[PDB]
């Protein structure tokens, strides 16, 4: 039946149209430098508002992929969003050090006042820091560093790994893991508000689901490159850590098989190994894209659910609990007795 359901959903001759009247912003790749600065100015100052930081990270992704290629990506994700192009505008009478008009980015959907206040706060912060110490600011502590967009996107990828969880657990995990993983950045930029940037990224991934696809493409485009920076390797590492998100019971069942839990041989589970095998066969049929089903928020996700095999699920959760890897996982345990017996056996095996 599960293969039949997959063949029903997959073999559809009609595509679905959504977001027909909507628009979204991209930035041409030729403005990468100009976006890089902005991605570094959200980092080294303390801002009252971090609403559009995730949008600026997506703008950097657009510059790294290309505006037309990003439009193609958003079309292939199944969305009719009309890409809009970022425009550089002169601030006004204000002039830069080179004697030209100070050109700032104009992003669609982002109020220009937000960009002005981010830039002004960053400039004020650096003015204060140079007032405190003279000549003590190397390149790596400046907003114009090429990897600052990657640092912002690494906070975004940390919040991306927890997209099948809730907002509170995701935020706590992102802050906790960013204190360690993004430690060099936090030393270079001692005042980037990781909780607020993470909340911005969670928001962006909620309203603009197609951007998830864009995010994924960036990872795909970034792990295919011959070279890269350290921050890009970190981004790809977190992006792979996001892989099997929303399907931890499949991984834990593979563990319970590798753990040789004897309670897998209980007749109640034995009556379900056939449908369990069908679920894993479905994973094999879907292939490498099956891991991204929940990250993409595919409607097809849920065919990979083992929730109709309650005894196998109970035994898998019990084996995970005995080994001590269950953590604070909140999956429901239908069969309590199988859970207890599996947990006892797994603890005995581990000891």
């Amino acid at each position: 039946d599960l293969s039949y359901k997959h063949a029903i959903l997959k073999e559809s001759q009609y595509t679905i149209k959504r977001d027909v009247g909507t628009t979204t912003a991209v930035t041409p790749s030729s403005l990468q430098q100009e976006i890089t600065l902005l991605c570094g100015e959200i980092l080294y100052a303390k801002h009252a508002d971090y609403k559009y930081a995730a949008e600026i990270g997506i703008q950097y992704i657009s510059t790294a992929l290309g505006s037309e290629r990003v439009q193609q990506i958003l079309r292939n994700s199944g969305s009719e969003v009309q890409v809009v192009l970022t425009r550089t505008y002169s601030l006004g009478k204000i002039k830069n050090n080179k004697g030209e008009d100070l050109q700032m980015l104009d992003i669609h959907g982002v109020e220009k006042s937000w960009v002005e206040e981010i830039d002004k706060e960053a400039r004020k912060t650096m003015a204060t820091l140079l007032k405190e110490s003279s000549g003590n600011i190397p390149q790596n502590q400046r907003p114009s560093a090429p990897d600052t967009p990657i640092i912002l996107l690494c906070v975004g990828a940390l919040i991306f790994t927890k997209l099948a969880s809730t907002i509170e657990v995701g935020l706590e995990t992102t802050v906790r893991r960013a204190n360690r993983v993004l430690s060099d950045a936090l030393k270079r930029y001692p005042r980037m508000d990781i909780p607020k940037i993470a909340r911005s990224f969670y928001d962006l991934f909620e309203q603009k689901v197609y951007h998830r696809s864009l995010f994924i493409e960036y990872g795909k485009a970034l792990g295919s490159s011959s070279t890269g920076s350290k921050a890009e390797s970190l981004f790809v590492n977190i992006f792979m850590q996001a892989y099997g998100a929303g399907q931890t019971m499949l991984r834990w069942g593979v563990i319970a098989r590798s753990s040789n839990n004897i309670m897998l041989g209980h007749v109640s589970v034995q009556a379900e190994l056939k449908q369990v095998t069908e679920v894993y066969d479905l994973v094999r049929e879907m292939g490498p894209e099956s891991g991204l089903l929940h990250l993409r928020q595919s409607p097809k996700a849920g065919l990979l659910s083992l929730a109709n095999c309650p005894n196998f699920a109970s035994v898998v959760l019990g084996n995970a609990s005995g080994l001590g890897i269950i953590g604070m996982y909140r999956g429901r345990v239908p069969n309590t007795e199988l859970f207890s017996a599996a947990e006892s056996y797994a603890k005995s095996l581990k000891e």
Binding site: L37, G40, E41, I94, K95, N96, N97, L102, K120, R123, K124, M126, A127, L130, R142, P143, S144
Partner: peptide, 7 residues
């Protein structure tokens, strides 16, 4: 003197 910082 805020808008001519090197960054």
């Amino acid at each position: 003197d805020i808008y001519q910082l090197i960054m």
